[PDB]
Amino acid sequence: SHHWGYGKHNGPEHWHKDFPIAKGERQSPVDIDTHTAKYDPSLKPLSVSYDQATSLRILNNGHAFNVEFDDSQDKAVLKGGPLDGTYRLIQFHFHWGSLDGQGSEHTVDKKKYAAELHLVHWNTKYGDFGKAVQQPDGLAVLGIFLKVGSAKPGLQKVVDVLDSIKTKGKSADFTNFDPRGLLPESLDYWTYPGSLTTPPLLECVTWIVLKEPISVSSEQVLKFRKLNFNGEGEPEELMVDNWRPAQPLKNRQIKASFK
Numbered sequence: 024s025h026h027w028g029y030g031k032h033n034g035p036e037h038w039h040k041d042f043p044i045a046k047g048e049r050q051s052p053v054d055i056d057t058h059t060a061k062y063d064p065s066l067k068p069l070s071v072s073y074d075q076a077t078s079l080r081i082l083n084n085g086h087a088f089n090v091e092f093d094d095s096q097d098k099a100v101l102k103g104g105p106l107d108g109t110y111r112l113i114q115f116h117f118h119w120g121s122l123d124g125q126g127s128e129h130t131v132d133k134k135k136y137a138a139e140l141h142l143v144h145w146n147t148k149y150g151d152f153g154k155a156v157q158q159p160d161g162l163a164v165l166g167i168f169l170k171v172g173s174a175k176p177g178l179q180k181v182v183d184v185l186d187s188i189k190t191k192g193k194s195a196d197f198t199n200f201d202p203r204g205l206l207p208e209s210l211d212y213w214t215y216p217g218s219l220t221t222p223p224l225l226e227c228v229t230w231i232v233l234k235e236p237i238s239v240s241s242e243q244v245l246k247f248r249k250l251n252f253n254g255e256g257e258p259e260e261l262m263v264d265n266w267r268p269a270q271p272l273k274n275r276q277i278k279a280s281f282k
C-alpha cells in the first residue's frame with residue numbers, strides 16, 4: 024500500500040523507488056526563472072468561471088486537506104490561456120511549511136513562499152478524473168502563492184473548520200464555500216507542462232501559476248500547521264512541510280501571459 028509522505032524516511036527523495044516517473048521528463052514543481060520565461064502572444068485569455076461552484080466536503084487525507092466540489096456537471100470551470108477545451112474544478116488544497124520562509128512547491132527566482140494553493144481541474148473531454156490523469160492534457164492546476172501579511176477574509180471559513188479535521192481520515196461538511204475569495208486581483212500567470220506533485224506523480228498537468236500572491240495572516244497559516252499527518256489516537260506528527268522541492272526543468276519552456 025501507499026506509505027509515501029514528507030518525512031526523512033518516506034519523503035520526496037524516496038518516492039522514485041515506488042514511482043519511477045519521479046525522475047521523468049516533465050515533473051513538477053519547478054523553479055520559475057522570471058528573466059528566462061517569455062511572453063507568449065499565442066496564449067488566449069484565461070477564464071476562471073467559479074460563479075456556480077458547489078463545494079461539498081473538506082477531508083484531511085494525511086498529506087493535506089482537500090476542499091471537494093460537485094464535479095458531476097460544469098459548475099466551476101477553467102478555460103482559455105494555454106488550455107484547449109473545458110476543465111472542471113474537482114478540489115483545492117494547499118502545501119505549506121513549518122516556517123513562513125518555506126512551504127511553496129513552485130519557486131520564483133528560487134524564492135519560496137509560505138504556502139501554495141492548488142485548484143485542481145480535469146479535462147471534461149476524458150469524462151472522469153481517473154481517465155483524465157492518464158492523458159498528457161488531462162488536468163489543469165491553477166497555482167496561487169501565499170505570503171504572510173494581512174488576513175485573507177475568503178480563507179477564514181477554511182481555517183475555522185480545520186479544528187474538526189485535525190487527523191488523517193477525518194472529513195466535515197463544507198458546503199456553500201466560494202473559492203473566488205482565494206484569488207488575487209491579477210490573473211497574470213506562467214504556464215508549463217508538468218505533473219502531479221505527489222505520488223503517483225503522473226505527467227498529466229498543464230500548470231498555470233499566478234504571478235500575484237495572496238496575503239494570509241500569520242494566525243491563518245499557524246492554524247494550517249496545527250493539522251496532523253497521523254490518524255486519531257496516534258502519536259502527533261504536525262502536518263507541516265508537505266511540499267515537494269523544485270524538479271529539473273529538462274526540455275521545457277515556461278511561458279508568461281504578460282508582457
Ligand SMILES: NS(=O)(=O)c1ccc(NC(=O)CN2C(=O)NC3(CCCC3)C2=O)cc1
Nearest residue numbers: 026027028032033034037038039040041042
Ligand atoms: N518509495 S516511497 O513510496 O516513498 C516509500 C517509502 C517508505 C516506505 N516504507 C516506510 O519506511 C514507511 N513506512 C513504514 O515503514 N511504516 C509506516 C509507518 C506506519 C505505517 C507504515 C511507514 O510510513 C514505503 C514506501
Ligand SMILES: NS(=O)(=O)c1ccc(NC(=O)CN2C(=O)NC3(CCCC3)C2=O)cc1
Nearest residue numbers: 141143152153156164218219220221222223
Ligand atoms: N499537488 S497537485 O499536483 O495539485 C495534485 C493534485 C491531485 C492529486 N491527486 C488526486 O487528486 C488523487 N486522486 C485520484 O487519483 N483519484 C481521486 C479520488 C477519486 C477522484 C480523485 C484522487 O483524489 C495529487 C496531486
Ligand SMILES: [Zn+2]
Nearest residue numbers: 116118141220
Ligand atoms: Zn498540490
